[PDB]
A paper describes a structure:
E. coli tryptophanase (tryptophan indole-lyase, Trpase, EC 4.1.99.1) is a pyridoxal 5'-phosphate (PLP)-dependent enzyme that catalyses α,β-elimination and β-replacement reactions of L-tryptophan. Trpase consists of four identical subunits (~52 kD per monomer), each of which covalently binds one molecule of PLP. The tetramer possesses a D2 symmetry, therefore it is a dimer of dimers with two different dimeric interfaces: a catalytic interface and a non-catalytic interface. Using kinetic spectrophotometric methods and size-exclusion chromatography we have previously shown that the inactivation process is linked to the cleavage of the PLP-Lys270 aldimine bond and to the dissociation of the tetrameric form of Trpase into dimers.
The two apo mutants of E. coli Trpases as well as the wt Trpase are found in an open conformation, different than that of the closed one found for P. vulgaris in its holo form. The RMS deviation for 464 Cás of the C298S mutant crystal structure with the Trpase from P. vulgaris (of subunit A) is 4.8 Å, while the RMS deviation for each domain is 2.1 Å for the large domain (for 260 Cαs) and 1.1 Å for the small domain (for 152 Cαs of the small domain). Residue 330 of E. coli Trpase is located at the non-catalytic interface while residue 298 is located at the catalytic interface, yet both mutants showed a similar loss of activity. The rate constants of the initial linear phase are (13.8 ± 0.3) × 10-3 min-1, (1.7 ± 0.1) × 10-3 min-1 and (0.6 ± 0.3) × 10-3 min-1 for C298S, W330F and wt Trpase, respectively. Both W330F and C298S exhibit similar (90%) total cold inactivation, but the time profile revealed a factor of about 8 fold faster kinetics for C298S. The rate constants for cold inactivation and dissociation are similar for the wt and the W330F mutant, but in the case of C298S there is a factor of ~4 between them. This may be attributed to the relative proximity of residue 298 to the PLP and substrate binding sites as well as to its location on the catalytic interface, in contrast to that of the 330 site. The PLP in the C298S mutant is loosely bound allowing, relative to W330F and the wt, a quicker cold inactivation and dissociation. In one of the wt apo crystal structures this loop is found in the same conformation as holo P. vulgaris Trpase. This suggests that the loop composed of residues 295-310 is highly flexible and may be involved in the transition between the closed and open conformation. The flexibility of this region may account for the faster kinetics found for C298S mutant. The location of the point mutation, i.e. on the catalytic (C298S) vs. the non-catalytic (W330F) axis, affects primarily the kinetics of cold lability.
Residue numbers in the entry:
A (entry chain A), B (entry chain A), C (entry chain A), D (entry chain A): 5 to 471
């Protein structure tokens, strides 16, 4: 059941209703690539939920109370205070480049263990219940190998488990043992986990994981773009915390990490910004090095920073993001969409709190992988309902930078994400109806072939035509 | 069918979900009177749609571009320009007291015909397809009798007519004839009409009415709080204008009035403000007298006025209010609620575009009129779903100021109104489910009796208890 | 000395610099009447300080936190709470029509004493240290005569007194005695006083006045558009309160009135809104009648009200308006202008905290009163420096509504007011330089004569030409 | 002469007036380091003018009209359109990391000439009238040496020249010749130039420089954080453009560069954001590579971006920043401060449109360089007037990372910058009065010595005590 909105809509952004003929022309003009469509021509934009959600009245109002001082800003103080009261962390470093908090702490933590515990860079290995691509990216660079230690039930769509994002405790213990504690720069706890479309991590599991890290004195970083939704799943599924508030669950949760790194563009409800925070003095030197490195990150003095209003807004957003009614509503809507698609016969490879990955291959079996069936599905959804979704398949994968040949892809998926507090149950039903229509007319949808193809990052600007 | 929102939600006002026990206590604390409930304790507030709707991004942004000059304000110019371009009217007088545009033009038009056509105040009669209580109020005072000349189908809920708000053309011609053209100070065309919960007036009808007024040289005032919705019904139901835009229909519509008076708190999408405008020079002297009278309205110089930002916002709102997709969506939602209630057996005395008037008497037949069955229904709806609705029955009617006895009331109704772009289809279903529940438990709902009763306007602050 | 701004400028409204030739054309186009000039063509607009001042960041931000509920609004609660904490008054009635709080309490207080103390309407007399024209206006209507009981030093520009706004205590006692306590509906304490351009009232004086009113059980209304500036003058000049904060002085000050009526467009720093508040239960019935009368003010149900954001903004503005550094700065700037003009030989009939009234008659002795020397001075100031000021002389006075002849005027003054936190010391010097220039070229300035003259309120739209 | 503000102040940020005793305690608490002071305790913050200036009403309003779409955003379109209309550049890449536009184009341009003209990385040399430290920073890294080719009059404070920021034309021609055209990756034209506190570059000079670059087919990058002020100096001092508007001068100016890189936190009037733009198709491949590299800048997909409102605001700011009256006023204020300090005997090593560098060494001759006389001066200015300025001397310079010994510094300067449209002439006089006071009490000011010193970037968090 889709829950009623625990709020009154106060400000809206008008979106025009287009005709099928108009959309048919638009998609062609865009070279059969939704990435090239004007935002105005997209009725329901499911491209991403990162920074595309709505804000509350107080969050919006905060933007007008900014202190733009280079240092000692009361707006920076308000943000730090929110972090202290919510996560119990004493040190706060605002980030603006976005999820840009990892490019900072990774090199710092590596050097730390290397100078204190003779870490061997050529043998360094970092662990996580599931590294976010970017996190894994900044880690591999610097010469650090990553390893995901997720549980067996994680990707098993056939079995229902309450916390599929959980760390594989024995796996982690075994990994550190194998690699050697001196060569483990850090452990990243992602909540909720990005595995299988977004799955929660239990507090019991986090405690166990932290005890392991603590035993081997290994820094733990909480990747928390969705800290609030994880706290909600814990309240909903972990018996021990049934009567705890989201805030209490969050405070308890962060006792099991030494620092946190997060994009504020998800649960924190803001269009931009991020955080890199440290719990206490035990990590003051890591805080210093990070703050310092943040300035000379380029090898010399460079200056940037969120405007005062943005820090004031995030200071409020961290709290509004934890509203219990809001979280129940947000998650119920996502689940409502998934259940609705399942009912009409739409098959998903994986579906979680983050996104739903529809199997375009199975929906459009007649289209060869090289003809991008998921990109064809994206264009059809737009033609039919003006919906914009992103292909996560051969089109995105690209070609081998050494052979110029198409890279092999395991599945042709179409990703659906949901901007927070942006669309209603009616839009959800509209999406479901759209898929019902596509499934009914599947046999007629055509494959695609390039007319223009960039050498790199082709999914963003390539143009194609129907086969 | 409830249409999907032709917009993205951008700003929300959080509303807490309460427990039944909490609401039971709240309603008692409020003395069984929703008017006494804190806004925060109301989940779905259907008290009124006047100034309680959402605004668009551009409308909100306009508030920060105000020119606060006492005179020659560019913000006043922008508002006047919008009126000129939308209605084709050259003179604009912003009003702030709200629907406070009538207290001005009424006395002015009376004096006008009295000095030019020897109007006899003791025999003056004003006509309208249906006077809004307030309009009728300011008219009666000053010594002017009013007469509603609506068509036979207007209040016939058994027959479906496309324009139930239409003027009774023959009735109007007959009325002027009877009263004498010299004694008719003005004719008010209300669009959409407030009769039968809100019914549209056709352009054909307005033309016919204006021709009649024009023949007898009688000023026509367009009461247009819902000018956009009327324009939408014309586009939807009057064949001749099927392919016309809302803007074109509006421009054509206003050729059939000499001036307009309107609260901007409805279709214009703003929380405050109103307008009093004149079409052309033919009514320049009426404009002068109104503007002048607006200053010395109290018999001497008094100063007030909308802030610059408010005029800039209304200048944008007049346009956003005419968005075709928005209007289709707004009206479809209202109709969705009505149809849903009808399906579950809820009976309404009248239901239109403005509001739905549920017959509490029939829903709660065991409760005597003097025990306020519609006030009891309002309290039950709040207890069950946290909905706030207004009683329009014996409770509201009050007592005879000369006998102190309860005044007789024809029906015990509970009014439901819908704030624009505020609630979703899910809230609509929640309301319907609520009524389904009340209808199922109707026999147990108790009547009410005073514990505290003001001498006047008792519905606002009276307290009652269950019988 | 002009004090430095106790604030950082955060948002500005661009104003174009015009050429003399451009202004010469503009003033002619405007018919030698600044009231007809576009705001954009005025470089420094000294027309009025009512609602034309700047707001603080928090005040502006508050506009986006509004609760638009018809009743039980948390925004109304915040405003009431501010009044309770600042003035110690338990009952708050927001007004929007502006200074529209008097049209309500006057009739209510008259009827009160008439039913409780057999007040005789034909002999009713209200007193005040100095009634604001509007206040005096609403009072005279209803059949109530007013009497200003100001001290001898009040208008004596030759003598410097710390509190020229003080009540003439013996005069008041004598007046009540003469008129009879039963015929005194109320006493209005205006702070600061509008006499002599704005003069403060001491707390000692208010206490004494209240004791007198209390002895005769006569309601006291505090007209407080400038409550904060009066509190500042008390802190600055009344020895006993030298170390008291503005807030403490304000709380003490309001113990000496039974209710307050105020336009929020002055010291409260907002562009619109007003208040009508009652101290405690002793005046609950007056509160009820006022609230009630506010709804049926027209003899029947009429609905209006400030938007939620406006109440939230005023709730903050009441506090920001009391900032000590702000008040010192605001008042010092006004005094800086006055002192500067005096230095260059410009003579003022009266000059206080509210405004400066330059004697145009003495500055332009060659121009006959009937040729409006103060209107000629206003046009010259605009031509020379793009400044807009209002004439307070024969032009404004108008003609006798019974003889059509010009009414005699005691002096031809040009009023200068200063919008709060809007202009700088540089603009002040620019104004002074402008007057220096006019004084130097006084002999060449020409008188004016009508080319277009309205029958009423001619100063707003009349056009004139040079003689 | 300080010009009057060509605007009305509309929103203010309150700043408390502190006592000397309070400041004495604050500076000690801050360890004699203004960088450690709370913004709230600083009356006049001259730390930096980067992102600390005010915005116009329209710029602020734009923040509420954002389109947060990941791609095809109408807000991105508005920003691109502004760039096209103002600079005539067809390609726009918004940057958020701040002046972070250089870390992108530098590597791209190097690789370009290296693959097309066999550029030799070991011999690459980039030229500029004067590289901004950061620009020079990103350039040196990547293996590129930089060379400033400024004119002889540039740093000659004894001679007055209209365009001290001019390129040394012969020097540039000679440099390219020497280094070899194939080894010159690009030429950066900084306007206004950062040399000597900020000096303008003439259009004649830019044309000449571009012709040289064009002859050798070398890409020209216009570093334009202060494009508007440079355009103003050209209008003021370059005879040929005396009657040209700022917009016309800007359009002409950009014909002499192939692309532009700029921080929007200066002349563009916004608190955050930057731009990297390309003129036409001739540089489409450079645009692609930059855009592409902007995504995989970390060696893999990373996502960030300015929120829609921020792009809408910058789209307006680019225009408001060019207002002629504003620019004249802004520059006159800066010059007013410089002239005022010179009058009282304060000596500056260099003073321009960007900042004034007071020679603390000469002002406080008794304090040894190692005791940081400029840091002592900063603390004294704060104690005396609550002003915060930044030391640019031995304190900032730091120690040799190889000897741990203090690095030698040519002069001990105290930098003064002025946030745009933030402070008034009164604050300027307050600053001047402050220096007058310090100069009078110079002999008593004490030197400083560390109590806490970070290993790197010590100026930001080091604590010191008086000697
Ligand atoms: Cl706020
Ligand atoms: Cl806008
Ligand atoms: Mg900043
Ligand atoms: Mg106003
Ligand atoms: Mg309202
Ligand atoms: Mg974004």
């Amino acid at each position: 059941k889709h829950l009623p909105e625990p709020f009154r809509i106060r400000v809206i952004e008008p979106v025009k209703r287009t005709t099928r003929a108009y959309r048919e022309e638009a998609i062609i003009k865009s070279g059969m690539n939704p990435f090239l469509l004007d935002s105005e021509d997209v009725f329901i934009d499911l491209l991403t939920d990162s920074g595309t959600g709505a804000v509350t009245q107080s969050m919006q109002a905060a933007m007008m109370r900014g202190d733009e001082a280079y240092s000692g800003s009361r707006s920076y103080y308000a943000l730090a205070e929110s972090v202290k009261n919510i996560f119990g962390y004493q040190y706060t470093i605002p980030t603006h480049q976005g999820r840009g908090a990892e490019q900072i702490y990774i090199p710092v933590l590596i050097k730390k263990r290397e100078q204190e515990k003779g870490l061997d860079r050529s043998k360094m290995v970092a662990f996580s219940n599931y590294f976010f691509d970017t996190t894994q990216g900044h880690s591999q660079i610097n010469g650090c190998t990553v390893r995901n230690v997720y549980i067996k039930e994680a990707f098993d769509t056939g079995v229902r488990y309450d916390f599929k994002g959980n760390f594989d405790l024995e796996g982690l213990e075994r990994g550190i043992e194998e690699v050697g504690p001196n060569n483990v720069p850090y452990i990243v706890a992602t909540i909720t986990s990005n595995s299988a479309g977004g799955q929660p991590v239990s507090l019991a599991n986090l405690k166990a994981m932290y005890s392991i890290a603590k035993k081997y004195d290994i820094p733990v970083v909480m990747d928390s773009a969705r800290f609030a939704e994880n706290a909600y799943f814990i309240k909903q599924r972990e018996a021990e915390y049934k009567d705890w508030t989201i805030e209490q669950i969050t405070r308890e949760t962060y006792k099991y990490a030494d620092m946190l790194a997060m994009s504020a563009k998800k649960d924190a409800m803001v269009p931009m910004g991020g955080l890199l925070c440290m719990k206490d003095d035990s990590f003051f030197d890591v805080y210093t090095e990070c703050r310092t490195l943040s300035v000379v990150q380029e090898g010399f003095p460079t200056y940037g920073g969120l405007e005062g209003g943005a820090m004031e807004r995030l200071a409020v957003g961290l709290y509004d993001g934890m509203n219990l009614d809001w979280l129940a509503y947000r998650i119920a809507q996502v689940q409502y969409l998934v259940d609705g698609l399942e009912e009409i016969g739409v098959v998903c490879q994986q579906a979680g709190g983050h996104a739903a990955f529809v199997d375009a291959g199975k929906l459009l079996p007649h289209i060869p992988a090289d003809q991008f069936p998921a990109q064809a599905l994206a264009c059809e959804l737009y033609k039919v309902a003006g919906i914009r979704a992103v292909e996560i398949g051969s089109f995105l994968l690209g070609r081998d930078p050494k052979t110029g040949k198409q890279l092999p892809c395991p599945a042709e998926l179409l990703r659906l994400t949901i901007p927070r507090a942006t669309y209603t149950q009616t839009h959800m039903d509209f999406i479901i109806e759209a898929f019902k229509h596509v499934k009914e007319n599947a046999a007629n949808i055509k494959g695609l072939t390039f007319t223009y193809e960039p050498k790199v990052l082709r999914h963003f600007t390539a143009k194609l035509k129907e086969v």
